[PDB]
């Protein structure tokens, strides 16, 4: 049971394109989420009786910046959390969430960054996906660009989403060219590059750091969706992905029995294991999310309805759907986020509203 306990509206009236709970917060500290929209990022604290305590924002000096996405990590030496933000200017900002100071930034991308993700096992490895058709992997410890995943066989239009698998050995990306593409980062070459990125200190050498140019995916398919693929997530070795066709497909590369690590780039088949249908979500840039454990799946649609899927069933097609509505919630939900313990679900909207659902 989720019940709606509170809502609010940010003062800029622009779309909130993203929301992330900090899953690296300390034991005993209150639960905290960031929202991104307009040219800002804002942090809030969850307290009892549905209260959403407004903390502090970071506002970009450029009036024309528009933040699209954010991701949490932490400093690897001090335990302290960090929040990365990015959007239309194609600039990644690493923000100290306590003071909201911009610690540092990365340029390179030829255009808008549509999503950011951190590696599940290495808090320094930041993946950005761009409107310039490419993904980039950054080491935010040594401030190095580890690799660009692109080229003619990479995406031929905007990359909209990507996700590391559980161990962070491979990436799956999706975008406007209707395709989902796989990029392994556990090859000798990539493990070497990450290692070399850690040994790099510009003060102690003469060389620039050389990026990898990865121009070939380890698998590709245009067979799942017939429009823009705007969100992707690993579910073990299986994939969850959506287009703007009111469906989330659960699928895998190759045939039913094929091992994901034995899939070759020539692979021609995919296997569909289920599809979760819903209504009125035919605009693009609409992201579902999952809880920490991947027991559930949340997606908002374009008229303010929420869909939650219970994934704690023995095959993906057996997922149990439930819905959450509120008569005052009628604007489009761009993204959802669960607290780490899944007691709270947050939805953020095109009219700048923030909706809080408690279990």
């Amino acid at each position: 049971s989720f019940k709606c306990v509170n809502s609010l509206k940010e003062d800029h009236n622009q779309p909130l394109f993203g929301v992330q709970f900090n899953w690296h917060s300390k034991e005993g500290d209150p639960l905290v989420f960031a929202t991104v929209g307009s040219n800002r990022v804002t942090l809030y604290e969850c307290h009892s009786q549905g209260e959403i305590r407004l903390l502090q924002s970071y506002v970009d000096a450029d009036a024309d910046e528009n933040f699209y996405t954010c991701a949490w990590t932490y400093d690897s030496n001090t335990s302290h959390p960090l929040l990365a933000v990015a959007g239309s200017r194609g600039i990644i900002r690493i923000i100290n969430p306590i003071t909201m100071q911009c610690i540092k930034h990365y340029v390179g991308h030829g255009n808008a960054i549509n999503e950011l993700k951190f590696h599940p096992r290495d808090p320094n490895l930041l993946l950005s996906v761009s409107k310039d058709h490419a993904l980039r992997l950054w080491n935010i410890q040594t401030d190095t660009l580890v690799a660009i995943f692109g080229g003619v066989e990479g995406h031929r239009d905007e990359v909209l989403s990507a996700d590391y698998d559980l161990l962070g050995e491979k990436i799956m990306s999706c975008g406007m060219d209707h395709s989902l593409k796989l990029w392994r980062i556990n090859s000798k070459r990539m493990m070497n590059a990450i290692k070399e990125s850690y040994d790099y200190n510009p003060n102690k050498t003469n060389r620039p750091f050389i990026s990898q140019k990865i121009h070939f995916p380890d698998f590709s398919t245009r067979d799942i969706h017939r429009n823009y693929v705007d969100c992707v997530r690993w579910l073990g070795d299986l994939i969850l992905s959506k287009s703007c066709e009111n469906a989330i497909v659960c699928w895998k590369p190759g045939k039913m029995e094929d091992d994901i690590d034995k899939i070759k780039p020539s692979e021609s088949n995919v296997t569909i294991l289920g599809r979760f249908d819903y209504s009125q979500c035919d605009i693009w840039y609409m992201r579902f999310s999952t809880d920490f454990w991947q027991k559930m799946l949340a997606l908002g649609n374009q008229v303010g309805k929420l869909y939650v899927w219970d994934l704690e069933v023995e095959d993906p097609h057996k997922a149990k759907c439930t819905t959450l509505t509120h008569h005052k919630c009628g604007a489009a939900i761009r993204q959802t986020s669960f607290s780490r313990d899944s007691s709270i679900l947050i939805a953020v909207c095109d009219d700048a509203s923030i909706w809080r659902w408690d279990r």
């Binding site: 605009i283 693009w284 840039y285």
Partner: peptide, 5 residues
């Protein structure tokens, strides 16, 4: 495909 309605 539109980004918004």
């Amino acid at each position: 495909a539109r980004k918004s309605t």
